[model samples]
Target: QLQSRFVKIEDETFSATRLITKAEFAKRTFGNSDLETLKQVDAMGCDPARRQDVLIVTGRLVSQVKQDLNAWISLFTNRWEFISRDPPGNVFTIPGGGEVPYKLCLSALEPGTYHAHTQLNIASVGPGLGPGMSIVVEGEPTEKPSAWSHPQF
Candidate 1:
């Protein structure tokens, strides 16, 4: 696939479209973020400002079909150590130090108005670093829940 097919986000596009979109700071303020709204969040950095801050807005999402917790996931340095030895296996230099996703899953979730909660990095890493983590959940009623997988920590 090409970049054109998918909407590009950043700078002007970030400011013009998302910053003041209908599902923004005013309308759906809390409780639960709608799916479309989550899509927008995906568009605008896969993160949103904490009302004022810019650059990044790490976030998370959970989806439940008929009230069962379909997904629980998180992203951040804390979620996956920020520093590493750059792994050495064969013969190449690897630059580590990046966000690695972590996942958690539950089977047999009860149906009916499931819930999701997302929290920012209770702490800060750096001023410029800002928040460079994001998470999104997805699930549907079925037999056994799938496994929660994260990259090598």
Candidate 2:
């Protein structure tokens, strides 16, 4: 089963979760670089924010099988702008009987109540979406900064 929660790390608050599977109990084994087969078994709630507000979403993949899962996490929303992500790589490895934490930082660019998700992409496997959270980005939409150089002529 997968369980998620909002946790405060230092001054930043992050949405975090854990992944567990029954394959561990069955002593099932998989390829060293096979796709991850676990799915979300519970819902995750995200915090509300205003337009232009930044948010941090985090997750941990716990593997009990005999292989490693290469994956990454991303914010699935068109209204939000991805500022950066942890690891700064295309993918990371979740070793068997171990866990790996992933994070994504994004900014809310629009004001609206939308259902957003922290999507998981496993190498070779299909994409799996975490529980949808109702994110209400309040406040008026702000103007974006224009691109300009010094000493405009």
Candidate 3:
């Protein structure tokens, strides 16, 4: 069985979004690499944070198969603001028996408990989901500041 872990909040500063937690997964394949599964190699969780506060998630994608796997992490929910991602793209390639590090950032925009997990999608292999954990976000949602507004035409 997969276990959920708590996110450690290293910093309390709301404005400064810092790395909150890390997750590791072992990519396994079956049936000619057409069926894939992301086995959780480590616990995943989310720390309580205020709405609009950004949280960074870092982890490794370990491939256990004998063939290269093209994959990407997919967050099924739209409750948070997708800040950015490392290796900047929708998909990344993980060599066979290799491990790739990934960084993902999301800003909390809603105050509620939500389940979050990494959905790994491999080319020709479909999608595989890792274990999920509850993310408890506090405080009310805030509007974007003027600095984030688009420039006037």
Candidate 4:
């Protein structure tokens, strides 16, 4: 069983560790069943932050799998976000069936605007034509990474 959390990585590098807790691990994975087969998951930030007093436009794109998934992010943000949908409309498959985990860090960005929530489009997800998810670009103390997984009434 596996689960994911928004870890505050040491640095945006190949060796930086995304710190998480055992409680967090248990909560996101064991606490939820839908995460059991959540293999080969990846994502990207499509838009920019919705704030004006921003310093850097940061975000993260990632994917997980019980196997390897050849995936990419979207558009000209290749310096930060990368994609496979462009450039001759290439098509690759996910869950090639081994261990394919992917992630991209959005850091060292110039001061600019960014989206609060980024939309995603997965070509192969579940029993549908497209799979999907979203991402929160970064953490904020003035805002707070802390949250309660509340029930929707």
lDDT of each: 0.23, 0.49, 0.48, 0.26
Top model by lDDT, which number?
A: 2
TM-score of each: 0.18, 0.55, 0.55, 0.21
Candidate 3 segments whose C-alpha is farther than 4 A from its true place: 1-52, 142-153
**Candidate 4 — which residues are off by over 4 angstroms?**
1-71, 74-91, 96-98, 105-108, 112-120, 124-153
User: Quick one: RMSD of model 3?
Assistant: 16.9
Please estimate how well model 4 matches the true structure, expressed as its whole-model Cα lDDT.
0.26
> What lDDT tens digits, residue by residue, belong to model 3 across residues 1-153?
221111111111122322221111111211121112111211122222421245666666667677776676755444565667665788777887776776666655556676666556677766654555566666444333344666687
Clashes of 4: 17
Looking at model 2, report the run of 10 residues with the lowest lDDT sum: 37-46
Per-residue lDDT tens digits for candidate 4, residues 1-153, read: 011211111111221212222223223444521323112111222211321111121233334544444333332221132322221134434443332223332321222233222222344442111122222222211111346787787
Give the better candidate number (2 or 3) by TM-score.
3
Give the poorly placed runs of model 2, Cα more than 4 Å off.
1-52, 142-153
Count backbone overlaps in model 3: 0
TM-score of predicted model 1? Answer: 0.18
After superposition, candidate 1 runs with Cα above 4 Å error: 1-32, 46-153
Best by TM-score: 3
